[PDB]
Design an enzyme around this catalytic site. Sequence first.
Site, PDB file in Angstrom:
ATOM      1  N   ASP A 200       0.773  -1.305  -0.114  1.00  0.00           N
ATOM      2  CA  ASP A 200      -0.046   0.100  -0.083  1.00  0.00           C
ATOM      3  C   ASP A 200       0.861   1.379  -0.269  1.00  0.00           C
ATOM      4  O   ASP A 200       0.598   2.404   0.756  1.00  0.00           O
ATOM      5  CB  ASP A 200      -0.976  -0.112   1.233  1.00  0.00           C
ATOM      6  CG  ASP A 200      -2.201   0.576   0.915  1.00  0.00           C
ATOM      7  OD1 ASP A 200      -2.306   1.367  -0.073  1.00  0.00           O
ATOM      8  OD2 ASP A 200      -3.025   0.857   1.979  1.00  0.00           O
TER       9      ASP A 200
HETATM   10  C1  LIG Z   1      -2.489   9.538  -8.194  1.00  0.00           C
HETATM   11  C2  LIG Z   1      -3.780   9.988  -7.416  1.00  0.00           C
HETATM   12  C3  LIG Z   1      -4.935   9.040  -7.074  1.00  0.00           C
HETATM   13  O1  LIG Z   1      -4.156   8.159  -5.977  1.00  0.00           O
HETATM   14  C4  LIG Z   1      -3.786   6.717  -6.697  1.00  0.00           C
HETATM   15  O2  LIG Z   1      -3.999   6.149  -7.583  1.00  0.00           O
HETATM   16  C5  LIG Z   1      -2.949   5.995  -5.395  1.00  0.00           C
HETATM   17  C6  LIG Z   1      -1.754   5.709  -6.049  1.00  0.00           C
HETATM   18  C7  LIG Z   1      -3.933   4.577  -5.293  1.00  0.00           C
HETATM   19  O3  LIG Z   1      -3.196   3.346  -5.019  1.00  0.00           O
HETATM   20  C8  LIG Z   1      -2.799   2.725  -6.200  1.00  0.00           C
HETATM   21  C9  LIG Z   1      -1.562   1.625  -5.920  1.00  0.00           C
HETATM   22  C10 LIG Z   1      -1.898   0.543  -4.905  1.00  0.00           C
HETATM   23  C11 LIG Z   1      -0.458  -0.106  -4.928  1.00  0.00           C
HETATM   24  O4  LIG Z   1      -2.024   1.210  -3.661  1.00  0.00           O
HETATM   25  C12 LIG Z   1      -1.151   1.856  -2.902  1.00  0.00           C
HETATM   26  C13 LIG Z   1      -3.254  -0.108  -5.105  1.00  0.00           C
HETATM   27  O5  LIG Z   1      -3.473  -1.334  -4.230  1.00  0.00           O
HETATM   28  C14 LIG Z   1      -4.209   0.857  -5.364  1.00  0.00           C
HETATM   29  C15 LIG Z   1      -5.309   0.079  -5.824  1.00  0.00           C
HETATM   30  O6  LIG Z   1      -4.019   1.726  -6.208  1.00  0.00           O
HETATM   31  C16 LIG Z   1      -4.811   5.035  -3.938  1.00  0.00           C
HETATM   32  C17 LIG Z   1      -3.876   4.626  -2.783  1.00  0.00           C
HETATM   33  C18 LIG Z   1      -5.904   3.918  -3.732  1.00  0.00           C
HETATM   34  O7  LIG Z   1      -5.945   3.648  -2.405  1.00  0.00           O
HETATM   35  C19 LIG Z   1      -5.995   2.170  -2.184  1.00  0.00           C
HETATM   36  O8  LIG Z   1      -6.991   1.491  -2.790  1.00  0.00           O
HETATM   37  C20 LIG Z   1      -6.878   0.206  -2.347  1.00  0.00           C
HETATM   38  C21 LIG Z   1      -8.238  -0.691  -3.085  1.00  0.00           C
HETATM   39  C22 LIG Z   1      -7.015  -0.004  -0.870  1.00  0.00           C
HETATM   40  C23 LIG Z   1      -5.954   0.470  -0.484  1.00  0.00           C
HETATM   41  N1  LIG Z   1      -5.866   0.409   1.010  1.00  0.00           N
HETATM   42  C24 LIG Z   1      -6.563   1.017   1.638  1.00  0.00           C
HETATM   43  C25 LIG Z   1      -5.232  -1.074   1.550  1.00  0.00           C
HETATM   44  C26 LIG Z   1      -5.910   1.925  -0.850  1.00  0.00           C
HETATM   45  O9  LIG Z   1      -4.902   2.568  -0.204  1.00  0.00           O
HETATM   46  C27 LIG Z   1      -7.377   4.561  -4.531  1.00  0.00           C
HETATM   47  C28 LIG Z   1      -8.199   3.350  -4.546  1.00  0.00           C
HETATM   48  O10 LIG Z   1      -6.906   5.063  -5.510  1.00  0.00           O
HETATM   49  C29 LIG Z   1      -7.821   5.424  -3.475  1.00  0.00           C
HETATM   50  C30 LIG Z   1      -9.108   6.125  -3.684  1.00  0.00           C
HETATM   51  C31 LIG Z   1      -9.562   6.928  -2.855  1.00  0.00           C
HETATM   52  C32 LIG Z   1      -9.017   6.829  -5.148  1.00  0.00           C
HETATM   53  O11 LIG Z   1      -9.647   6.643  -5.937  1.00  0.00           O
HETATM   54  C33 LIG Z   1      -7.935   8.346  -5.287  1.00  0.00           C
HETATM   55  C34 LIG Z   1      -9.234   9.492  -5.412  1.00  0.00           C
HETATM   56  C35 LIG Z   1      -7.104   8.148  -6.159  1.00  0.00           C
HETATM   57  O12 LIG Z   1      -7.622   7.897  -7.426  1.00  0.00           O
HETATM   58  C36 LIG Z   1      -6.127   9.338  -6.326  1.00  0.00           C
HETATM   59  C37 LIG Z   1      -5.825   9.871  -5.060  1.00  0.00           C
HETATM   60  O13 LIG Z   1      -6.690  10.539  -7.147  1.00  0.00           O
END
Ligand SMILES: CC[C@H]1OC(=O)[C@H](C)[C@@H](O[C@H]2C[C@@](C)(OC)[C@@H](O)[C@H](C)O2)[C@H](C)[C@@H](O[C@@H]2O[C@H](C)C[C@H](N(C)C)[C@H]2O)[C@](C)(O)C[C@@H](C)C(=O)[C@H](C)[C@@H](O)[C@]1(C)O
Length: 299
Positions: A200
């Site tokens: 994460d």
């Molecule tokens: C860039 C800007 C975007 O951020 C990212 O893309 C990062 C890089 C994701 O991580 C990426 C990378 C990775 C590896 O997580 C770090 C991956 O697992 C997720 C799916 O996407 C994040 C953090 C994800 O969170 C994670 O979602 C998972 C389903 C569960 C996890 N946790 C609670 C257990 C949680 O942190 C998730 C879904 O995007 C959060 C929701 C709120 C969003 O849609 C938000 C608005 C994002 O779109 C964003 C901020 O605009």
Amino acid sequence: MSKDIKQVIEIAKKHNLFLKEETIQFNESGLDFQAVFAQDNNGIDWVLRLPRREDVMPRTKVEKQALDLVNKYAISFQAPNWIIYTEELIAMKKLDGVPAGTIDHNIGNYIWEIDINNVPELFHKSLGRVLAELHSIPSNKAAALDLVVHTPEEARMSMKQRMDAVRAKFGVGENLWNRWQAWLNDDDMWPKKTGLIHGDVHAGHTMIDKDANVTGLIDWTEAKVTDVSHDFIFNYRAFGEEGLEALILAYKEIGGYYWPKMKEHIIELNAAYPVSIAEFALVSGIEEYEQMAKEALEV
Ligand SMILES: CC[C@H]1OC(=O)[C@H](C)[C@@H](O[C@H]2C[C@@](C)(OC)[C@@H](O)[C@H](C)O2)[C@H](C)[C@@H](O[C@@H]2O[C@H](C)C[C@H](N(C)C)[C@H]2O)[C@](C)(O)C[C@@H](C)C(=O)[C@H](C)[C@@H](O)[C@]1(C)O
Ligand SMILES: Nc1nc2c(ncn2[C@@H]2O[C@H](COP(=O)(O)OP(=O)(O)O)[C@@H](O)[C@H]2O)c(=O)[nH]1
Ligand SMILES: [Mg+2]
């Protein structure tokens, strides 16, 4: 809040932690626990977790095992150390620095501590060192790990199975599905090594100093031994291909596992982002994630 502050003080006092009442602040937390910040009488900053569910020990076992590993082996970054660990309270000293950014769920993006239009190169250099160290931790030397552990072949099959599960619970857009399958069947693109990952890694969990060096990592609930690529996805999504390349470069040059199609593979993993959204929707049950998944999955 007075109600809650007195309980926090009472609960902490019960575990020999004595807080400055006027520093206690409550985080907007979830369905597992309530995060609380407070400073103690010695002047040290603490993070407390007030449990909101039963079976704290079974539910935290994996995370604690990951923390035990990192605290044992890693020196290039700080990780939480649960000095107080009971069914009534988990408490740990606050890591140094601040999160590189925090998620604003309204806008669907980050509130950045760093300049997103001028990302300091030290962020990538330091995170590269950090991930390289983390991913080389010899988890195999532990006598009784309960972490999920994949060989490279198992990591590939895990994605294959997870994808099928999503095609069948939500349904998946035809075009998106076929990109995924092309990825799965590309033997040469897939990594031939796995390692202990954070699982994460994102701006909210990367603590940085004033120079944007990553000095610590928090929230290890997703730790497991598998494809290291998951810990690179944040760099790609937040900083684009330039930030991804910068991280890969630093990682490779300090001895991290590298293969010719690493960047291409991570980009394909990014295209599989919907799988994770779908799973979190299924698990958490939250509509926004549902619809977010539905849109992401292109159903
Ligand atoms: C860039 C800007 C975007 O951020 C990212 O893309 C990062 C890089 C994701 O991580 C990426 C990378 C990775 C590896 O997580 C770090 C991956 O697992 C997720 C799916 O996407 C994040 C953090 C994800 O969170 C994670 O979602 C998972 C389903 C569960 C996890 N946790 C609670 C257990 C949680 O942190 C998730 C879904 O995007 C959060 C929701 C709120 C969003 O849609 C938000 C608005 C994002 O779109 C964003 C901020 O605009
Ligand atoms: N600055 C700082 N913030 C922390 C620390 N530990 C936890 N937090 C904050 O508390 C929030 C919740 O902690 P976390 O372990 O991620 O809880 P979770 O998101 O529900 O899994 C995080 O998003 C952080 O903003 C720390 O050591 N330093
Ligand atoms: Mg968190």
